[PDB]
């Protein structure tokens, strides 16, 4: 009987790759996509309407 072509009747779970909570294990390889991006945050301006400004208005 063919059985090696199994579907995901029993899917694997997260939390067990490199460094996931293991982080001292994290390993010194890191190169390609992770290294360079957007290190300074853009905070939204005052007056986004949402919690306190909406109550402030009718």
């Amino acid at each position: 009987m063919t059985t090696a072509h199994r579907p995901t009747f029993h899917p694997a779970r997260g939390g067990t790759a490199r460094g996931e909570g293991d982080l001292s294990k994290l390993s010194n390889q890191y190169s390609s996509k992770d290294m360079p991006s957007h290190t300074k945050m853009k905070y939204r301006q005052t007056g986004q309407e949402t919690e306190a400004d909406l109550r402030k208005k009718d």
Partner: protein, 87 residues
Amino acid sequence: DATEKTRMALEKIVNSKVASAAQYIRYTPSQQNGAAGSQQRIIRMVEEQKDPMEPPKFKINQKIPRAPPSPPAPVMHSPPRKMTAKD
């Protein structure tokens, strides 16, 4: 108070974590045999200088099964709705 508490712990962690990616100790030893006459020791810690050329010391792709789940929480259902013959 909650928001300030949350960041301040992870912050100290993240700085060591990207690094992963005088000072003394006074030691009071319960083993009373001791240094001569001294109920405590005081001791100097220095850090081994990391050689900036030396490549990673140890193999760390060692892999072991997931740690057992925390012991089961009681299952707490309402009593089974029996629906036996027709459903």
